[PDB]
Amino acid sequence: PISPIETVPVKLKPGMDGPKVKQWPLTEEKIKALVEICTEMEKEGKISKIGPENPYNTPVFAIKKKDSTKWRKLVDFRELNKRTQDFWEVQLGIPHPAGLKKKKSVTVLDVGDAYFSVPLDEDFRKYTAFTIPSINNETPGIRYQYNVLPQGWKGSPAIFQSSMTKILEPFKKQNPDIVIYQYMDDLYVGSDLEIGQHRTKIEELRQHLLRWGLTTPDKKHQKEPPFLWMGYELHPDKWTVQPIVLPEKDSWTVNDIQKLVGKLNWASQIYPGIKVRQLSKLLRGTKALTEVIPLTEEAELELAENREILKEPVHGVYYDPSKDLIAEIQKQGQGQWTYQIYQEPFKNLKTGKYARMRGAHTNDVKQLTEAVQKITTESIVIWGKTPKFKLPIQKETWETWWTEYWQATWIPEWEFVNTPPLVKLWY
């Protein structure tokens, strides 16, 4: 806009220094993109060009949010975050409503565009610096630094939190049962209204924002449903399952009781009381593998009992909010992916399984990235904080292609993994 607001002074952590992260190499297509986007921002004052006395740097990517005919700039403030909002997790911490996961329909609104109005503390600016790349190293990166609260930076919501709760006030007044969590550029309006009335209450809210603080969200559909139209409605209350299910069968064999003594034996690590010596003893012999054998009646009390210790959850499993959440995903096959979200080995706080298209646009990567954004968003709703993904995939391939099907404005933390061995039998 054109309104000089005072500037919330920002300080990084104790004896911490700005981020100096390498800017990954992009496609000419994407350079060209960013180039224009920035050429514009500079034109709107949102950003500025720097000199070489700015040692700092944070990576930038180009993506398409709503598939749209045009791109979005996605700055990866992941490092600058740890070096700041982690004291803008305190100095300005945003509290997480433990009941939003409880609503029936959580819709998500993009508000990151409010920020662009608040000028950024001059002394901090030097840290928001990013660099638009060159191809084959001809010219030197184009250098920019922010003059307004940036987007991927968690210091932005934090600072805005004031203007926000204000705007959202003569609305939580009216609608008091709706819960509204703000996590970065995303608003998370949750309700219990009937699918459609809710969808209405949203547009209601959405129009309020626009009416009130000029804060603009977005229109999903153009009121035109091409059989391929959404809006982003989440339904948390229906988020539980117990995928771990011993097989159900009439006739068993050595191979079958065996593969079973395995998965079962291995569950012991995660489920307190389940021994299986009387069921497994039925194997102590060197019988053929195809050989069919009936399940001892005596032992079957274990299959029975265990079949049941696999209906009722674990115990000493609580949420440590000092610890960070870890999400392990496994390639399942035919477009299906299993995932656990834990904190301490074998004490999961949730388990799911994405899948969206078996063999059409079936591309390991695209799937993985979409599953990553799902697992994320869920947790952002359940615990108000994103996990760190142990991703089953080659570091470089991932680094090359994630930006391809990514549509989130935030980015989590990840690391690549050795191999899910006997852990695949979690289907």
Given the rule CB under 8 A, which residues bind another protein?
20, 25-29, 31, 50-55, 57, 135-140, 143, 254-255, 258-259, 261-262, 265, 277, 280, 283-291, 330-331, 333, 363-368, 391-394, 396-398, 400-401, 419-422, 424
State yes or no: 86 annotated in a binding site.
Answer: no
Q: Which is nearer to another protein, 76 or 370 (CB)?
A: 370
User: Please, what is the minimum distance in Å from the beta carbon of residue 134 to another protein?
Assistant: 8
User: Please, what is the minimum distance in Å from the beta carbon of residue 367 to another protein?
Assistant: 8
The dihedrals phi and psi of 132, each to the nearest 5 degrees, come to -80, 120
Q: Which is nearer to another protein, 64 or 126 (CB)?
A: 126
User: Please, what is the minimum distance in Å from the beta carbon of residue 393 to another protein?
Assistant: 4
State yes or no: 186 annotated in a binding site.
Answer: yes
User: Please, what is the minimum distance in Å from the beta carbon of residue 176 to another protein?
Assistant: 45
Burial class (CB in 10 A: 0-12, 13-18, 19+), 139: exposed
Of 2, 178, 153, nearest to 79 by C-alpha is 153
Q: Which is nearer to another protein, 84 or 409 (CB)?
A: 84
User: Please, what is the minimum distance in Å from the beta carbon of residue 276 to another protein?
Assistant: 9
Q: Which is nearer to another protein, 104 or 366 (CB)?
A: 366
Provide the 8-state DSSP code for 60: E
Q: Which is nearer to another protein, 24 or 229 (CB)?
A: 24
Asked if 159 contacts 116 with a C-beta cutoff of 8 angstroms, the reply is no
Strands 388-391 and 326-333 come out as: parallel
Q: Which is nearer to another protein, 48 or 363 (CB)?
A: 363
User: Please, what is the minimum distance in Å from the beta carbon of residue 49 to another protein?
Assistant: 10
Cα separation, 385 vs 183, in Å, equals 8
Burial class (CB in 10 A: 0-12, 13-18, 19+), 96: middle
- Tell me the Ramachandran region of residue 184: left when phi exceeds 0, alpha when psi lies from -120 to 50, beta otherwise: left
Exposure letters 293-310 (e unless 16+ CB within 10 A, then b): bebeeebeebbeebeeeb
Q: Which residues does the annotation place in the binding site for Mg(2+)? A: 110, 185-186
Q: Which residues define the annotated binding site?
A: 110, 185-186
